[PDB]
């Protein structure tokens, strides 16, 4: 099970989630179960936390192949969070048993995808480039921002979300 697109809308008003189940033959029995949204405040390592930001159960929408693909567009202001200074964690679940021929390690019910707003980062890069235009010297804040973004990338791809939030809160919010 995987993500098709997991993006925040360019208008900074919707959080786009478009999930799908993998096309391989032995997820025929497997479906999509729920969508749980967490922020940098309510995250826990062991799956979604209690009192989450927004829970979604997918039988509610439909009345079986329609249930294998889902698309959500959440008005972020309705979630009562800041679209610019929020890092969303999007969990998904399966509620389904694959066949007995699955190769090992592929049978995992849950996934996760981190989300942030790239507009503030784009504005910071534009500001630093404007500074570079004057006298052709590289500000050190620009290199610091680049390397800290790469640090958060490494933390996310290695799954070390606690230190990822620590860096986010320490550098890209305050």
């Amino acid at each position: 099970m995987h993500f098709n697109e997991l993006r925040i809308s360019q208008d900074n008003r919707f959080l786009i989630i478009d999930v799908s189940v993998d096309n391989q033959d032995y997820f025929e029995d497997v479906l999509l179960d729920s969508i749980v949204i967490d922020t940098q405040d309510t995250f826990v390592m062991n799956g979604p936390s209690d009192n989450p930001l927004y829970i979604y159960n997918v039988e509610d929408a439909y009345d079986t192949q329609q249930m294998k693909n889902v698309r959500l567009e959440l008005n972020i202001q309705d979630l009562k969070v800041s679209p610019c200074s929020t890092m969303f964690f999007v969990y998904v679940k399966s509620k389904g048993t694959p066949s007995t021929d699955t190769p090992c390690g592929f049978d995992k019910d849950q996934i996760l995808g981190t989300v942030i707003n790239l507009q503030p980062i784009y504005k910071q890069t534009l500001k630093y480039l404007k500074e570079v235009e004057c006298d052709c010297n590289i500000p050190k804040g620009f290199i610091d921002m680049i390397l800290k973004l790469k640090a958060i990338e490494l933390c996310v791809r290695t799954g070390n979300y606690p230190q990822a939030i620590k860096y986010w809160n320490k550098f890209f919010i305050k």
Binding site: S34, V36, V44, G47, P48, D50, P52, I55, K93, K95
Partner: peptide
């Protein structure tokens, strides 16, 4: 945690296992 139903069924299955 966010337990799914099937996990609960597993829990009661293994609890009534020592029935």
């Amino acid at each position: 945690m966010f337990f799914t139903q099937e996990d609960y069924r597993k829990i009661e299955k293994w609890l009534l296992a020592n029935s």
